Design a protein around this nucleic acid. Structure first.
Lengths: 38, 176, 286, 141
RNA sequence: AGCCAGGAUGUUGGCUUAGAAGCAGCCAUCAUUUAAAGAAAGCGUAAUAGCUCACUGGUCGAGUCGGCCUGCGCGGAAGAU
């Protein structure tokens, strides 16, 4: 999970759910599109 | 809501034991009980079960919205069951069932034979296909996902242990 | 002696990819780790191997009880393989004359001169399991230089008359030149094989395809590595036709006033081209 | 006719026997002997002077079967068969070269009227005027 | 929002055609049928077969959706007996 202050909804099918409070964004086929902070 | 427009119809062959918050479902081949939270108002009204969110816990529409989906699965799981098949794609990798134990030909210097708990009648038609049978929807995944986590799908060959319906995304080397 | 090593899969994979007709003979006993027997099906005998020794036992027994039916359904396909090899075994597959170990190979050996079936054998080289088994088929399923069509020297340019010469010692001499290695002792060396005829030591062996004169020096045989001087080369040995002044790929090694070959087929093309450069300017001289 | 299994209309000039690589996949969909689609159409291909892309459609069936529908060449390539060059659309509304009147357009529409139930005469007339303006062509009668 | 569900089909959409064949990119950017379809969004990809968005055409049978303004909240937030 890459970390950066900006979670920008980047991939076309990008889920966003708030697990534990810190946002981590869920793609389907791209592992590269998953950030976690912010 | 959609969940409030979703009542569940218990059929004949599965008995409920409504001691208020604690419901123990006497079914076909097991006992699928869940001790829910106090954000629910349960009533097996006539035959079709009706539920309700308790006051104070107005977020119990969520907490019983779990429950409406829950008990529907329980009355159909204790009778019919889940076929949870896994596909072993590994070079020299086999699967064979004995009693309640599964072998794991997993490319190690030592064998891994793990015993599997109750609510499991496992089978193996061949070395690469493995049945799992169960009554709870949780236990039919939890014992399945532990095997898959021992050898995850490798996205350079397609190697690994993977589900029947799961479709991996294998890549290409592209350098050497 | 490995995982995923199914013997019956691979021989029945040839009929799908290679499209050939293999009928295997020496089958498998053991779950690849406690593997002890190789199932020869003609004599219907399993062979014991070494506990872990580099080569003690050859103990033949019967078919074990754990494979009494797979030997049944596979032997009946072995004895099929002579009724459709020769036409004469067709009426005793169905009539029920006994298909012995010695009778069936007399048809199948003639099925190696046309090569429609190949003979397969499972076992281990490194675990010393099968190597002592694999030798007896070579004298009975691989052809001899006197059982084959021998040296066939055609002519030169006059007429196409292919002439089967004799495989015995009663012919003009004949050989071929291949695997022509080098050495810092004598220079050029060969790994040549003589098909028939006998040569003495010291001869005006020519190379009659490229019009050059050579003389036959001190011939040396090997254990693939060690110099052993072979003086008298008999018909069928493999040695080193030493001291050839010029020699090409596959020309004759033959006395004059004799039959003559002129044959070079499938000259290859080395494709990838890299340019070597010297280190010192004294190096480019060498 | 059929449904979500397969329906693609792709065929180009039938002087080429071997399936052209990009057409290949529309024959590489439901397991054909590619010699069969070469031997089906050539009985009627000897009634033409080849050079124009003639279209066919593919449509499939359960076991190993297939079917196909023969029509006439479209008027889009018939616009640029008479005009000499096969590709004129470089600038649509800035090129004024080349005239064919409506009489040519209807006689290449009777061969549509004798073949197909859509692509009707009077409705295609503005689109056979519409494929003229995109190519940069003029029309007068 | 999901299961059935056609992805109605003129066309090869050029150019330059080697494939730039709706899926590389610049100019057009009409539509034969319009109760469902654009000379077009990605993946499959040299091109396409596979899978969709397009209208949800038929079922559920009620609410639902994207942004503007504020009350507060979370992440951002790592230091040295």
């Amino acid at each position: 999970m890459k970390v950066r202050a900006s979670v920008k909804k980047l991939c076309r099918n990008c889920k966003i759910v708030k697990r534990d409070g810190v946002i981590r964004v869920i793609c389907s086929a791209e592992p590269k599109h998953k950030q976690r902070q912010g | 809501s959609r969940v409030a427009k979703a009542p569940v119809v218990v059929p004949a062959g599965v008995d409920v034991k409504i001691n208020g918050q604690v419901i123990t479902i006497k079914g076909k081949n097991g006992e699928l009980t869940r001790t829910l939270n106090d954000a629910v108002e349960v009533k097996h009204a006539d035959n079709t079960l009706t539920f309700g969110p308790r006051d104070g816990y107005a977020d119990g529409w969520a907490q019983a919205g779990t429950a409406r989906a829950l008990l529907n699965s329980m009355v159909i799981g204790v009778t019919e069951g889940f076929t949870k098949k896994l596909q072993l794609v590994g070079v020299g990798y086999r699967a064979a069932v004995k009693g309640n134990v599964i072998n794991l030909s997993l490319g190690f210097s030592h064998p891994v034979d793990h015993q599997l708990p109750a609510g499991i009648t496992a089978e193996c038609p061949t070395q690469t296909e493995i049945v799992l049978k169960g009554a709870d929807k949780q236990v039919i995944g939890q014992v399945a996902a532990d095997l898959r986590a021992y050898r995850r799908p490798e996205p350079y060959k397609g190697k690994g242990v993977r589900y029947a319906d799961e479709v991996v995304r294998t890549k290409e080397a592209k350098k050497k | 002696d490995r995982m995923g090593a199914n013997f019956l899969k691979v021989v029945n994979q040839i009929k799908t990819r290679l499209g050939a007709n293999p009928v295997p003979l020496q089958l498998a006993i053991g779950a690849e780790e406690h593997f002890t027997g190789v199932v020869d099906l003609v004599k219907m005998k399993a062979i014991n191997w070494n506990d872990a020794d580099q080569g003690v036992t050859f103990e033949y027994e019967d078919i074990p009880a754990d494979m009494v039916e797979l030997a049944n359904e596979w032997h009946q396909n072995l004895i099929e393989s002579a009724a459709e090899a020769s036409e004469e075994l067709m009426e005793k597959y169905l009539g029920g004359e006994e298909l012995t170990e010695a009778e069936i190979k007399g048809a199948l050996r003639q099925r190696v001169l046309n090569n429609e079936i190949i003979l397969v054998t499972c076992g281990s080289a490194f675990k010393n399991k099968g190597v002592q088994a694999m030798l007896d088929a070579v004298i009975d399923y691989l052809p001899s230089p006197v059982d084959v069509p021998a040296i066939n020297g055609i002519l030169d340019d006059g007429k196409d008359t292919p002439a089967e010469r004799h495989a015995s010692d009663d012919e003009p001499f004949s050989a071929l030149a291949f695997k022509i290695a080098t050495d810092p002792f004598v220079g050029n060396l060969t790994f040549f094989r003589v098909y028939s005829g006998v040569v003495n030591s010291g001869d005006t062996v020519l190379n009659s395809v490229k019009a050059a004169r050579e003389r036959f020096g001190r011939i040396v045989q090997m254990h693939a590595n060690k110099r052993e001087e072979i003086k008298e080369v008999r018909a069928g040995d493999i040695a080193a036709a030493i001291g050839l002044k010029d020699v090409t790929t596959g020309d004759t090694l033959c006395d004059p006033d004799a039959p003559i070959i002129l044959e070079r087929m499938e000259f290859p093309e080395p494709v990838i081209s890299i340019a070597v450069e010297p280190k010192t300017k004294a190096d480019q001289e060498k | 006719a059929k449904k979500v299994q397969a329906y693609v209309k792709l065929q180009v000039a039938a002087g080429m026997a071997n399936p052209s690589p990009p057409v290949g996949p529309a024959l590489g969909q439901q397991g054909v002997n590619i010699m069969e689609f070469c031997k089906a159409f050539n009985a009627k291909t000897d009634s033409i002077e080849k050079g124009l892309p003639i279209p066919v459609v593919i449509t499939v069936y359960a076991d190993r079967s297939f079917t196909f529908v023969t029509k006439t060449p479209p008027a889009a390539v018939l616009l640029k068969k008479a005009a000499g060059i096969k590709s004129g659309s470089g600038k649509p509304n800035k090129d004024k070269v080349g005239k064919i009147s409506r009489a040519q357009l209807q006689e290449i529409a009777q061969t549509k009227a004798a073949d197909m139930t859509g692509a009707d005469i009077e409705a295609m007339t503005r689109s056979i005027e519409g494929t003229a303006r995109s190519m940069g062509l003029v029309v007068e009668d």
